[PDB]
Paper text:
However, ribosomal subunits are exported to the cytoplasm in a functionally inactive and immature state, requiring the further addition of ribosomal proteins and the removal of transacting factors that block ligand binding sites.
To capture a series of particles downstream of the ECL particle, we partially arrested ribosome biogenesis in vivo with diazaborine, an inhibitor of the AAA-ATPase activity of Drg1. Ultimately, insertion of Rpl10 promotes two RNA conformational changes in the Rpl10-inserted (RI) particle. H38 is retracted away from the eIF5A domain of Nmd3 to adopt its mature position, where it makes extensive contacts with Rpl10 (compare Fig. 1f with Fig. 1e). Additionally, there is a subtle (~10 Å) yet important retraction of the middle portion of H89 towards Rpl10, which drives H89 into its mature position to stabilize Rpl10 in its binding cleft between H38 and H89. Release of H89 allows it to reposition upon Rpl10 loading to stabilize Rpl10 in its binding site (RI particle).
Residue numbers in the entry:
A (entry chain i): 6 to 137
B (entry chain X): 1 to 226, 230 to 237
C (entry chain V): 53 to 150, 152 to 156
D (entry chain z): 77 to 127
E (entry chain Y): 225 to 352
F (entry chain L): 10 to 88, 96 to 163
Amino acid sequence: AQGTKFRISLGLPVGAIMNCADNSGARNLYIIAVKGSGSRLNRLPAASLGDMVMATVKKGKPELRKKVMPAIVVRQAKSWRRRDGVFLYFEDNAGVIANPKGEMKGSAITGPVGKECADLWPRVASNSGVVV
Amino acid sequence: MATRTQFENSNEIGVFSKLTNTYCLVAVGGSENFYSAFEAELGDAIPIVHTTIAGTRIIGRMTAGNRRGLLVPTQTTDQELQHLRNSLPDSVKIQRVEERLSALGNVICCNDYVALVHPDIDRETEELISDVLGVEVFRQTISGNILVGSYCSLSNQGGLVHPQTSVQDQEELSSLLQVPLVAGTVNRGSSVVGAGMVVNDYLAVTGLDTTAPELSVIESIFRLQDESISGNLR
Amino acid sequence: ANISFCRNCERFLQPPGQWIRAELESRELLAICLRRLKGLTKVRLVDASFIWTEPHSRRIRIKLTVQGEAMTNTIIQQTFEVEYIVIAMQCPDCARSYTNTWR
Amino acid sequence: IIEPSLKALASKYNCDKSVCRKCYARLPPRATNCRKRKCGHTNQLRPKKKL
Amino acid sequence: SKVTAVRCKKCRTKLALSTSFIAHDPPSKESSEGHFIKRAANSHRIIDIQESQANCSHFFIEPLKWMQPELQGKQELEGKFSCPGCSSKVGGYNWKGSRCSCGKWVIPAIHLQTSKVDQFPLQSTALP
Amino acid sequence: XXXXXXXXXXXXXXXXXXXXXXXXXXXXXXXXXXXXXXXATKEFKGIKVTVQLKIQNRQAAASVVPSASSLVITALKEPKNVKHSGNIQLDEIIXXXXXXXXXXXXXXXXXXXXXXXXXXXXXXXXXXXXXXXXXXXXXXXXXXXXX
RNA sequence: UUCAUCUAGACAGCCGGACGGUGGCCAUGGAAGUCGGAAUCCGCUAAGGAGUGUGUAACAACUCACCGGCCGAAUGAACUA
């Protein structure tokens, strides 16, 4: 489901609590896995801007809580290197929740969206207000 | 008429293409099958342009345009701006726009005559849209959503809107847009109707998983529908 | 599904090795849903209250409402019933299948 | 579409063989013993199943 | 009722009208024809039983005018054809059978698969 | 031009499903093909097998039924198996039935062709009680009168 | 080791023929010797089954039963270590 993306710096390991950018009632997401992650002894699998993570809701609507459901990172605080040269980074981490196809459950996104997420996922760019 | 096709394996066409009355825009990473949809049906009337915007392939959601003009965001480079000013005709004007709201496609829903913009867009853009596109600008939201370009496909004839939309507010917009409006779903139950499909006067292209009752609703409000080769020879 | 049963001593076999002697038609509603292949993936096991079967017939019928939907908009409920086949066997406490381990 | 004069021409190379039961080898249909050594030249042969 | 048309998806070409459609509506539902039988190599031996589907997923039409150069040129017993503007596999022709997905038999068959084609009314819009 | 002697089997009223595939490369028809078959099976029973051949060129109809097989012995009768087991009074009309049958049977006239249509009739009662095997072994009827 | 075949022509192979009522009849989308049920008839023949197997959607084609010559001293089966 996930296409080709150039490697960017991994800023979100397992156990991170990122914000929730959409309007599906959830307040923050708790990352428990990264889809397509590697395998190394004692290594925590880490996420990045645009990866697809399995995540639970720790705060928000009680209907959304206590179930594991996939999510997509839209902002990142660790600085990454774009190919055209610049090192950039947002202010906080953020994610939106999705079905395992990649379609989005929320209606809109507040805050800016990273550009390598809008190219990779077609639904996130449809609901994005500001692209970087 | 009502042709269906898809970019690489995605149903949404409005993200990856921008179809107007006098030109067309497509992203560069396409197969031979996706390009042959527009080339076979538009012919040589309007110029098809392969382009990218801001280093992206989402040019249907970054740009905003109609018959008379095109608006591109700030991160569009000078190499991509000089390419568009050649391939498009001399009638259309291309203008770079300085925004905090970068994605102009989700923000602006426009045609030849009447445009709806996001309510938190600023006044220096409202002066810019009305003088470049030559369109009256109306600040208004689709009943529950601020992204008016993603959830409301619009043409000169009619306009398809978000499915969860009250009838009492459709009559508001039809009073404002002066075109008849129908709510519906495209791509087998996706509420994002502006990003699923594109439209102009003589063509409307949507995704491959658009079902047959959904395709009836599209061509009806847009009024693009209308035989001797078929017959019995026994 | 299949549920094991002590014909003499009235016990129930759990999947690994257990022999939980439960009261008949009171809390066997609660001991079955561990043995069932289906996990917590089904929506919200919102309710479960089994319906009557004949006491001579060796089967148990149950009803339940999973109620949690994710069909892209809403959470629409759904009601269904499944059946269980009772199988009797020995349970070596109740079988006496005797000689080293005397301790 | 296959023109069964040519289907009989191809089935001699594909279907009309025999299979050893022990080593699963592909053998000629008139054979009596398997030609390999890792099954010990065994003679328990079966015909190959037709479609 | 009114006449209808069968337009090709991704071609937008009218392949077949009504005044066609030999619809053969009832399946048999009995054990010899309503079920799909897979025998064995020998001795009339049933290995599989498959139940037929709900609705007949084809359109059995008369041989039409646009089909004629594929049926005159290299005339064979079975094959397939396409839309005349996209070269996509729409339906096959067969002078044997291929009952329906739902199962009867037909006649020598000109089947038009209802996957990747759709049916629209020939009259005006419904105006909902 | 071109001649083509095909074939046709079974049917009582109309059928030709098997043949229908034979007219694929040939002249395509469904209406006149069952109509030309209807001109063949006119006043023929639909229970019985009707074996025929049709010769055609540019939709040409042919209806011939040589009947040198069991088609004759099923014709002169009254209509997990519909039993054809009858006590037929054939022996007088079987002298007339073998007359139409022995067009070439390639035997020395009727006396060696009175046993072909006899054992071809593999069901009927014939004349009297039985008319099969030893009940029609020695033929002392008509015979040389037909020669 | 024990059987059995063969110069009175084997085994192995090659060369010919295998016809005519006839796509026999019910049975079925279709079954012509060969998906199956039950009958086993008759013509001609040197000899030839309402067919021994391979096959085709159904035929065809081919093989086998059976009849002829062509070839020239070996061959088949079980078993023991």
